[PDB]
Structure 1
Amino acid sequence: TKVFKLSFKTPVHFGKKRLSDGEMTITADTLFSALFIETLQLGKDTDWLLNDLIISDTFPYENELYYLPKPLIKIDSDNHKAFKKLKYVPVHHYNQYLNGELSAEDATDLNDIFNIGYFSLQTKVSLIAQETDSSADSEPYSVGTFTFEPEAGLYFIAKGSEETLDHLNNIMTALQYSGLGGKRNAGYGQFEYEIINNQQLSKLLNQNGKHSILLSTAMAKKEEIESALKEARYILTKRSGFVQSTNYSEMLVKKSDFYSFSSGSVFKNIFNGDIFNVGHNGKHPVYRYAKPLWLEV
C-alpha cells in the first residue's frame, strides 16, 4: 500500500460537462481509464491490472500537508453553515473531525488556509474554417484550466499485491508523459510523480472502527446493493461521456450513462464493486472502475 505524489507545473483541464469548465481533482473512473489506455498503448497485458488492483480517488495536498474528502457524517449540533462550506479536512485533524472535536473558528481558519490553486479561462480560436481563404468568422472558444502553487499537487492511494504494485509503478513511469486530463494534445496536463510513505496516513489507513468512509467512486454489484443500503449516507453522481476508438463515428459513439456513489459516502455494510461494462454496439468492451477503498473509522 503506497501513495503516489503528483506535481504538475503546467495547467490542467479536467472537465465536467464542457471544455470551459475547470475542476481540481479527478475521479477513479478517469484514473483507471488512463491507466488502461496507457497499458494498451504500451502493449502489455491487462488481466493483471484489471481484477486485482484497487485505486482511490485523487486528493489535493499543500506544502507539507495532505487532505481527504469531508465525511458525510451526521454531526449533531446549530451552525450547519461553516461546515457546509468545508470541502476537505487535513489529515492531522481527521480523527478530531470524526469525533466532533472541530470548532467553528477552527473550521473558519482551515477554510482560510486552504488555498491550493486558482482557476483560469484561456480563450482560443480556430481558423480551420473558410477564414483561411474567404470571409468567415473566426470561432472563439474557451477552456477551463486550474493551476497549483509550486508546492502543491495531487496524490493517490493504491493497494494490492506487490507484483501489481510494481506493474502500476512501471505504467505510471510511462504515463507521466501522457496526460491526465482534457486537452492532452493541446498543451495541458503533464506531471512528475514520486513515491512517498507517510506515517500518519498509514496509521489512518489501518485504523479499526465501526463505520466506513468511501474514498473512491463505486457501485455495488446487483446482488449486494440490497444489503449495502441498510444505513447509508451517500450522494450519487452521474458519469457520462464519449469513448476513444470504439467505432467509426466519435460523434455517434457515446458511453451509456452510469451512476455511482461519491467519494465521501458512509456505509455500514461493506460491499465489493466491479468493473462494470458500459458498452453496446461496439467492437471492444469499454470499462468503468467501481471498486471501493475503505478507511475504517
Structure 2
Amino acid sequence: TFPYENELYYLPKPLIKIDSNHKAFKKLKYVPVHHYNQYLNGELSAEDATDLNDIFNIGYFSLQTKVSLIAQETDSSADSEPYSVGTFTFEPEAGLYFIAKGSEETLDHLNNIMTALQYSGLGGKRNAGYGQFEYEIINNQQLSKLLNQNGKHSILLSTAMAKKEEIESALKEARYILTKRSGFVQSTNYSEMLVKKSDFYSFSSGSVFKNIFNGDIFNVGHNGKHPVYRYAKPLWLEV
C-alpha cells in the first residue's frame, strides 16, 4: 500500500546510494510521482527535500481509550481493565492505493473480490468499528509511465524473499532492509493463543537489486489443519 493526498500519488524512497547533509534525506520516507525520476537522478535539492517533507501532511495518529467490563464488575467489586487502541485518520482527500498486475481474467476476479472486501475491513479491530472503505479504479498516465520503463537497477516495491535456489545470485549487489514479520492466524486450531505463525523475514519495500528474482508464497505453517500462506513476490520498478 502507498498513500496519496488530493491529486498526488506517492511511492517509497529507493535505498539508492547518493553521493553528496545526510540528514534531510534520512527524515524522508516517501517521494511523490512528480519528482521520482528527479530523485533517481539527483535532481532533488535539500530545500526541495524540506519542502516535500513540509507538504506531506496526509494523516494524523491517535490513541483512543477503552474499558472492558466483561470482568467481575458483572459479578462483584472488581476494577475495570482499561486498554488502548492505536488508530490513524486520513484527511478528506487521502487514502491508500494498490498496484496489481496479471492476466485480464485474474484482474476481473480481483475486482469481484475487492467488491466483496469493501464492506469487510482491512485492518485490526474491524468488528469493533474500524476500517471500512470505498474503492475506485483510476488510470493515471504518469504512474503508468513510471511503471513501464526499462533500466539496469530495480526498486522492490513490495515485500519479497527469494526462493532457496536463487538467493545466492540474487544478493550480488544490493541495498536492503529486513523486517521480522509475525502474527497469529485465524481459524487454524483450537487455541488462538497457542497458534502463531513462525516468524518470517523478507526484504522491505524500498530495496534495490541488480539481478531479478521471482518469489513464492511461503508456508509459515505447522501444527495446523490447513496451510497458512505468507506472500513474497516482488513488483519491480525498472529504473
Please, what TM-score do these two structures have when normalized by structure 1?
0.80
SS at match of 2:49: helix
CA distance in 2, matches of 1:224, 1:102: 35
1:113 corresponds to which residue? Answer: 55
**Over the residues paired in the alignment, what is the CA RMSD in angstroms?**
0.4
Q: Tell whether 2:161 aligns with 1:223.
A: no
State yes or no: 1:209 paired with 2:151: yes
Secondary structure at 1:247 match in 2: coil
Q: Secondary structure at the match of 2:19?
A: coil
Rounded Cα–Cα distance in structure 2 between residues aligned with 1:130 and 1:277? 41
Structure 1 residue ranges (4+ consecutive) displaced by more than 4 angstroms after TM superposition: none
Cα separation, 2, equivalents of 1:202 and 1:290: 23
Alignment of 1:19-98 (within 5 A): 58-77=1-20, 79-98=21-40
SS of the residue corresponding to residue 226 of structure 1 reads helix
* 1:58-207 to 2 correspondences below 5 Å: 58-77=1-20, 79-207=21-149
SS of structure 1 residue aligned to 2:34 = helix
Q: Structure 1: how far apart are the matches of 2:71 and 2:158?
A: 43
Instruction: Spell out, residue by residue over 1:133-179, the C-alpha distance to the aligned partner (whole angstroms, 9 max, x if none).
Output: 20001000000000000011000000000000000000000000010
Match of 1:92, SS state, is: coil
Matched length: 239
In the alignment, the residues of structure 1 paired with residue 190 and residue 211 of structure 2 have an alpha-carbon distance, to the nearest angstrom, of 43
Deviations 1:226-246 (A, max 9, x none): 000000100000001110000
CA deviations on 1:204-243 (whole Å, 9 max, x unpaired) are 0001111000000000000000000000100000001110
Partners of 1:64 and 1:280 in 2: how far apart? 45
Q: Distance in 1 between matches of 2:55 and 2:193?
A: 43
Find the aligned partners of 2:187 and 2:74 in 1 and give their Cα distance: 30
CA distance in 2, matches of 1:121, 1:274: 37
Q: The residue matched to 1:179 in structure 2 has which SS?
A: coil
Deviations 1:72-121 (A, max 9, x none): 000001x0000000100010000000001100000000000100000010
Deviation at 1:132, TM superposition (A): 1.5
CA shift for structure 1 position 264: 0.1
Measured against aligned partners, the alpha-carbon deviations of 1:268-287 in whole angstroms (never above 9, x if no partner) come to 00000000011001100000
Q: Distance in 2 between matches of 1:281 and 1:86?
A: 42
SS at match of 1:237: strand
Bigger RCO of structures 1 and 2 (CA < 8 A, at least 6 apart): 1
How far apart are the structure 2 equivalents of 1:283 and 1:271? 31
SS in 2 for 1:191: coil
| TM-score (structure 2 length as normaliser) | 1.00
- 1-side partners of 2:186 and 2:195: how far apart? 9
Deviations 1:168-209 (A, max 9, x none): 000000000010000000000000000000000000000111
* Distance in structure 2 (CA, Å) of the matches to 1:117 and 1:254: 31
SS of equivalent to 1:204: helix
In 2, Cα distance between equivalents of 1:277 and 1:115: 38
Q: Give the drift of 1:288.
A: 0.3
Helix, strand or coil for the counterpart of 1:158? Answer: coil
Structure 2 SS opposite 1:194 = coil
